[model samples]
Target: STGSATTTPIDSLDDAYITPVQIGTPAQTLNLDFDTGSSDLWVFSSETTASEVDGQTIYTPSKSTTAKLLSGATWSISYGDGSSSSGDVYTDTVSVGGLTVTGQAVESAKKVSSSFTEDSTIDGLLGLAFSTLNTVSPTQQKTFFDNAKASLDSPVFTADLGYHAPGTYNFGFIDTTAYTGSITYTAVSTKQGFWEWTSTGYAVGSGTFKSTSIDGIADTGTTLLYLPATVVSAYWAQVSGAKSSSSVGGYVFPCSATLPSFTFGVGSARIVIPGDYIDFGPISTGSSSCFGGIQSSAGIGINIFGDVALKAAFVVFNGATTPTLGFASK
Candidate 1:
């Protein structure tokens, strides 16, 4: 089986991408963040604290005839940014695009962090990462992708994140017309439950490609590109008036500054990120200093190729016996 879905950026900065997901019977649809960095398909549901429910939609399991409680099962997840959510579990028919999975684990949020409640655009998250990272207790649960993989024509999914526009997510089959040039595949390490891979190297704007092994995760959940301090500094050095500010957090520069494009290697293929994508909007509502879309991963522990980088190319998360990642210019 093959399925395709459209994912749109929630805001101009592309803070996050949201896709409509149909959960339960009779289908209660909610806009969910299609996060490839985590492994729990959780949602803002009827069980959520009323105070935590802002303008976002909530899933009511009782209204769905197919919904069944996973008694004694519970889940909790914490993100790198310090926000978290936890709740009991339920099993129901979950469908993405047209791909359907029966008895899919749906983590119903009992409590959510301030950030989640404030962001009314997304009801919750639909994790696409490895199921090993699932937070469900007693017995680990599989992700929507995992459960649907067996029924898919191909056990793979692709991400085409857009910049200030709507993109696409395809399952079971790769859309050849969605990308340009032949895809470059690289070995993936799921040891940490992330779509982790070692990039061949990178280049600053039009500068020469520096030969180095950079390990990072392709994370859709994260909003910016984070690399090693050395690599990040090299890119920022090319921008005039750019500085790493402790007060502002990460690197910031004059909004009028001409930013340079960034290029990273996937095997022998090179994907180029436009300069405009690097200028991650202003520091404040009326501030002239703009926050950089690329920053140092010194504090993050692992380098991350977030949406800023992913938007530059079409990404394929291959779920074969030996998982691999494929990248192609869009």
Candidate 2:
């Protein structure tokens, strides 16, 4: 069986991509952040304190006849951005697109950080990373993809993210017409519980391709593309009026700056990110200074090829025994 769903950016900056998910017996729909960077499907629920709840749609387990409490099971997760959430667990009928998984572990949030409460766009996150990264204690549970892989026609899912428009997430099979040319496959290392892989190299605009290998993870959960300082600095240097600013955080430059395209090597194929993609958005409303989508991963140990990079191409997360990632031009 196969399933397909539409994902859209919550805001103009493409802060995060969200897809609608249906949970429980009668089906309670909620916009969830389909994050591949982590494991653990958690949502804001009736258990969450009213003080912590802003405008997010809460999942009412009591309303679902099929919702069953997972006795003694609990889960908690902290993101790199410092936001965290913890909650008890339940198994319910979870559906994404047309794919349905009965008894899927659903973490109900009892508490959430200000970052989550403040942003009402996403009610929760559907983790697509390996189940080994699941935060459930006593007995870790599998992710939606992991649980549904066996029944899928092909044990694979693909992410087709758009710039400001709606994108599609297809499970069980790949849409050959969704991409152009051929896909370049690369071995993935899930030892860290992420879709980690190494890029052949990168080139700024139409410059010569550097043959250096850069290791990173393909993360749809993250909004920005973070790479080694060498690559980041090299890209920013080409843009006039660009500078690392402390007040605004990270790198910022004139909104009118003629930004150059960013190209990264996936195997021998090169994926180019348009210059406008790098001109993320304005720092403040009507402000001329805009933040760059590509940032330095200096302090962070691992480089991340987040949504900024993923949006540039079609990404396939193959769930075969020996996992691999396939990238192709859209």
Candidate 3:
């Protein structure tokens, strides 16, 4: 079976894509964030402090007949957004879409940061990155995708994220119908536990595509596109009155200004991001000032091609000996 599932974005938070997953016997349903930015299958559970968990649906391992505790096992994870969760571990029968795994390590969070505690809709995170990035201690645990990769017809998955709309995540096979034009493949460097790659160059709207190499990661969990400081300054310079504001956060400008398109080169494909997409929601709900979707990754070291960029292309996460990234117009 190809083992496919449809991922839907949360109405309020367009930050990540969520997929319904079944865990343990009798199948306790949980809507999990299928994140490619990290590697840890963790969930809000009964183990979490009742006072800390807001309205999240907690996973009850005791109720699951197929669940078993992995004694002395534990896991902790933190995202770039400062969201964090940590807790004990369990081996449970976990299933995503039509794919099932007999003994998957399911981390039951005992603690979580405000970023996670307040977001009640997302039950947990199902990381799809390399198993080496897993946070489980004593013995690192493999993700649902890692354990299932050996059984898959092809060791690969495709992420088709939509623009504030429902998207699809296909495992084991690529659905040609999901994208248009031939997929342009590029080599990926995963030394930093990410699908890191360098774009040949970039351009502003119909402007010149300068040969400036930018190294970044294809992060699904991240919300916006982030580039180097100078690169970000270059893009904002195209817009008048655009300036960085610590109070408003990142770069902000008048919503009435006409924005230019931003394009990033990957192999032979040129992924162009429309100007409208750059005008992220207003800096303040009722204010005329708006924040730019693209920001500077000054200290972050590596640039991040988040949902803003991914939504513009059909991304293929190739699970080969030397994993590569394939992109196509969506």
Each prediction's RMSD to truth: 0.6, 0.7, 1.2
TM-score for candidate 1: 0.99
Descending-TM-score candidate ranking = 1, 2, 3
Instruction: Tell me the tens digit of each residue's lDDT in model 3 across 241-313.
Output: 9999988769998888999999999976799888877877677678888889899998777799998888889
Assess candidate 2 and give its lDDT: 0.94
Give each model a TM-score: 0.99, 0.99, 0.97
**Which candidate number would show the highest lDDT if scored against the true structure?**
1
Q: What is the lDDT of candidate 1?
A: 0.95
| Model 1 regions lying over 4 Å from their true place | none
Clashes of each: 1, 0, 0
Worst 10 residues of 1 by lDDT: 275-284
Candidate with better TM-score, 1 vs 3? 1
In angstroms, how far off is 170's CA in candidate 1? 0.3
Following a full C-alpha superposition, what root-mean-square deviation does model 2 have from the true structure? 0.7
